[PDB]
Structures are given as structure tokens and as C-alpha cells.
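Holo prediction — chloride ion.
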Amino acid sequence: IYRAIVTSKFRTEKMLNFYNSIGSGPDKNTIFITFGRSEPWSSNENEVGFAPPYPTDSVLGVTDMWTHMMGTVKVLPSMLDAVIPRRDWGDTRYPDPYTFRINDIVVCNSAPYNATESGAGWLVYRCLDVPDTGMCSIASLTDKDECLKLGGKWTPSARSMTPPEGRGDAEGTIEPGDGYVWEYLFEIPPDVSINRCTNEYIVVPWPEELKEDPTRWGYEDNLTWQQDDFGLIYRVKANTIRFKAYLDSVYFPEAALPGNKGFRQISIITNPLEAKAHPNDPNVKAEKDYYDPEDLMRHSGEMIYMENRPPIIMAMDQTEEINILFTF
Amino acid sequence: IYRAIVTSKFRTEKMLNFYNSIGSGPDKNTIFITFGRSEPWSSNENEVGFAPPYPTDSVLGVTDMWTHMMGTVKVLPSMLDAVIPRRDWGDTRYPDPYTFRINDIVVCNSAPYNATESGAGWLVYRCLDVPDTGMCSIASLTDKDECLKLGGKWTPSARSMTPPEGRGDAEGTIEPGDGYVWEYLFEIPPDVSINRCTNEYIVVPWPEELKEDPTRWGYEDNLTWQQDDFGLIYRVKANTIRFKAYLDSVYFPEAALPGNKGFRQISIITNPLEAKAHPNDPNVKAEKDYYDPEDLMRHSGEMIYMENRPPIIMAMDQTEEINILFTF
Ligand SMILES: [Cl-]
Ligand SMILES: [Cl-]
Ligand SMILES: [Cl-]
Ligand SMILES: [Cl-]
Ligand SMILES: [Cl-]
Ligand SMILES: [Cl-]
Ligand SMILES: [Cl-]
Ligand SMILES: [Cl-]
Ligand SMILES: [Cl-]
Ligand SMILES: [Cl-]
Ligand SMILES: [Cl-]
Ligand SMILES: [Cl-]
Ligand SMILES: [Cl-]
Ligand SMILES: [Cl-]
Ligand SMILES: [Cl-]
Ligand SMILES: [Cl-]
């Protein structure tokens, strides 16, 4: 009777809501990362290939996380980046370095096999069309239009000759002539590619910082902002946030003593409350940038993420980077 | 290397993020609903059991929807209800009317075989414990404190014979004596039962409206806010929003006329832009409560939901109730 669905765009929207909800007051959320568990999982926890057991999503699991909690750190907006799968043009160290499909988002100018414009950071492009000669995900369909009309994924047999370059047409269209067609999307500045992007992911600017400094992301020429309001994240189906947070022992010396056993758990709690002199006292949203677990109220807030890992030892004046992915 | 997970609380979290993002302003989100398609799917449609085609999530699809436009109603938060599956205790109209399982939320005082307190509305409870004897529903793992000491689903046998009544102890805990234990949650006002709930779902109040009017939801004697801060939706694992929006034909005496073949498509768009005269102009966000398919900047905002189904007739000053379920 009923035939409905939610679009790919909704996924990007749940991501933005999450990112945008972070702030202060009763309508916003405060996000904290917790670290804990100084006692071993088992005597083999330090051997290569060791996997610790999965955390348990139950009231017991939450209680356990709190009982072993050693410290907490407030997560700020600037610690969160929207990201998408990284696909480098011409990287002959991975399959299909010269073959792509409609909608693939490829990165150029990020390695010698990519080089196209000394003076520009990494450059990202979306494939708009491919050669008419190839193979369809649905084998029997040997015609591109037929393939695509039925919903098959066409993979061309004619390789991409040269990597796209420049910002293309007034519409961003680029025609290398090898039968491929590309659309310039944006640029990634070095401070970002160098410290925020990884082997598997690239950053895609949030709408606000984009609208704020179009030139920083080589976006000054874009016109689509007249309709999609600098919604680059929706244009590329971004639906994953990556945290880049830090644990500074300077703030938890009592747990970074010369021979401590390290920490093995990480979790994310939204809106934990502050500790209270008397249970019936008013609730206070924890907003300082860090807390000793005992200065927070036990079991308050909502534990939305739980992670167990092999131990990692903290030194008196060192810092541990914590990364975490949220797919929406 | 790592073993992590997103807890079920994250789903409620996303649902609350969405509900909380709706408002007025750039950072805030506006949301409109749409409908259309006078064009028939085909002859064999007005029949019975005619499953229409599945919409298309691509520019090609959003294209059809926009063109076949007709009307657009703005959605207010008051039109959104966090809901959960309705399981009335003793409803022999459905499977297992007397057997329950931990974490199942059950409604009481909703029918004669349910009655426990006249003058009050539906009372809701959560199954804390279930009877000893039972089949773990996974290999063996059968006994008492076992299929539990390893997170194994549990389906008992010594059926529930007595509905839980009252508000339990200082923690809402209740023990009938049939090997079942329950926790008092809240109460639904008669007006909400009639107008918001259905044979399928019951409404669970948002934290804010719960903090503002506790007694209205049989919540005045509550104590758990001292840690969960009125986060009832989290307690019952609510992760679905049910739209309560009406299409008022008196808001348009054009498409509503005797001939009228009807419409067949539903659509939700977020943050749409008010059509401009000069593209380069600064974009404007629609903040009215209604717009004509041409009054808006085509392809503006973001389309997050598409629905196709049989035809529906629109009268003069008639109002067809439009409903939609979003699952986070
Ligand atoms: Cl997707
Ligand atoms: Cl948002
Ligand atoms: Cl539990
Ligand atoms: Cl919990
Ligand atoms: Cl920040
Ligand atoms: Cl290749
Ligand atoms: Cl950085
Ligand atoms: Cl935004
Ligand atoms: Cl797109
Ligand atoms: Cl406390
Ligand atoms: Cl498309
Ligand atoms: Cl309202
Ligand atoms: Cl039963
Ligand atoms: Cl009923
Ligand atoms: Cl609220
Ligand atoms: Cl327009």
C-alpha cells in the first residue's frame, strides 16, 4: 500500500544536527569523553593482535564504565570534523587508480602521482560521467544507458588518462577529453590535510566556516550557494564525524605516576550533571573543560558511545590524541 | 585492536537532536511538508492492494517530486511526538497477551481486563524482571542467573497473571508475585490517548514538557530526574518521531474541486529558500506557515523524505490528516 523512504540527505542532516547541537544553555548539549580502567583485561593484553572484549550496552555496562572512570574531558566543536571516504586519483598502490564511476569523489594534487598545481592544496572532484564502453554491475546489461536506467553501476573499460585540474566551467564542469567528465568541488588547505585528513578520510568543511572563508577552501567561485546555502556536506553525502580530542596528563597527575598501568576504556557522555551536596539539590549541567569523575554525579548524562582497547600508558607531561568515528 | 559501539541511547539522542533543532533562525531548522501528483500511476490503482512504485533518491527523483508539487505546510514542534510501540497488557487481539520480556514497556489501565485505577489514564510500566523457568532462545544458556550473565534474550513460561498497579515504591518498583517485576514509568492524559496515540503507538513526553508539567504525566512523585533530569524518552528507548500534521483544503480552493483525481506523493524538506528574482541576491529562509510550489526557490533547502502511495481526494474546506514516522 505505502511506498516511502528517507533520502541520503537526511543522513547528512542528522550529522549536522549533532554538530550544531553542541553549545550551552538548556537547548544545547555538552559532550564529554571519558577515559578509564587501570586494571588489566587479562595478562596477554599487551601482545600483538590482542582484542579486548566488547563493552556491554546495559545498565551494568554503564555502571562499570563509571566505576573505572579515571577522568573526563569536554569536547568542543572545533574538535569535530565532517569527513568522507578518501579516494586518491592515480595512487597505483591501490586498485582502480585510473578507473572511476559516476559520483565517485576523487582527490588530486596530494602526492606526486596527483600533482597538478604547486600553490594549491589538495583538490577534490566528483565524477560526472564516464566512457560509454564498459561493464555493468548487472552483467547481462551491456549498454551504459540501459545499465544506468535499470540502476546498475557502470564501470568503464577506458581508463582515465589525466587527472582533472582547475575549477572547470562556470558550473565547475571539466572535460579532459579521455571520455571522463569532472566537477570541481573544493580545496583542502595544508593545515587541514596535514593534521586532520588521514589515509582513509578527508575533511569536508562545515557550512558556517565555509560561508565564512570561501577562499580558504578554494570555494570563492562557487555559485550553487544560491540554492544549497553552502551545503557542501549534503552535496557529497557526508554522514560521518571524526573526533580529534586530547587527554593531557598534566590535568590528571594522580593517574600518570611513573609506573601506572595505563587506561583501557573510552566513552562519550552527553550532558553529565555536576556532583551534588544533597540528592534533591538542583541539577547543574557540567560545563567546565575537565572533571575528576568524583566531581561529577554518578550515572548522570547519557552514555551514547563505549569503547574498549588495549592499554595505553600516560606519562606525567604527555598527551594522548583520541580519535572516534560517528556514522549517522 | 579496538572494540567499540554506539549505545541504543544514541538513537534517542539523534531523535532529540532533530526535535530540538527545529525553530526559527539560521542555526535553527524549519521544516515543511509537501504533497502532489495528479498524474495516475496507472489504471490499476484505485483498486485495492495496488503497491505504487518506489520513489527515487537522486536528483532525478527530487526532480519529479518538485515538479509534481502542489502544497506545502510548515511543521511546528507541537506537530511532533516521540513515540514507542504500544503493548497493552492482556490484549488477546495480538500475540502473547500475558507473556512479557525484560525492557518491554507495557500499558495498563486501558481496558476492563487492564483496569486498576478509575479516574486515571493509561499507566505505563517497564518489565524489570521476568520468571525463572524459560527457554533462552539461543542454543542452551538455560537456568536462572545465566542467560542473563551473558546478555541472552529470555522468553519465560510462567505467564503474567496480574497487572501491576500504582506507582510502586520510592523507585517505582513493583512485584506482583507471578515471577514478574515492574517499574512505574508515567501516565498518559486522556486527551493525548485519544488524539495522539494509536492502536500501534503510545506517546512519550519530551523532557522539557515533562519538567514543566510533571503531574500532567503522573510524574510528580518521580525521583530519577535527580540523575536523568527528566530524560524519560531515554529510559524507554524512544527513537521514533510521529508527525501529526493536517492538510487544510480551505487553505487553497484551487486544486480541491469535484473532478480532482488526487495526489500520491509525500515530501519533507528542511530549511527551504524563498525564491529570488536575482540569483546573486542573499538567500532567504522561508518562515511563513505556507507556500505555493512556485513561491519557493526550486531545489532549495534539503529533501529528506519521499513517499509514494495510492490516490486521495481533496474536498472544499476538508482536512486530510497527514502522518509520518521517522526512525532514528
Ligand atoms: Cl547514503
Ligand atoms: Cl543542523
Ligand atoms: Cl540493562
Ligand atoms: Cl544507564
Ligand atoms: Cl570550538
Ligand atoms: Cl585503473
Ligand atoms: Cl589540528
Ligand atoms: Cl549549519
Ligand atoms: Cl548529491
Ligand atoms: Cl552526586
Ligand atoms: Cl543523482
Ligand atoms: Cl509549537
Ligand atoms: Cl501470552
Ligand atoms: Cl484503544
Ligand atoms: Cl524538549
Ligand atoms: Cl527561485
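READOUT: Residues B 58-60 surround chloride ion (ligand 11) (CB under 6 Å).
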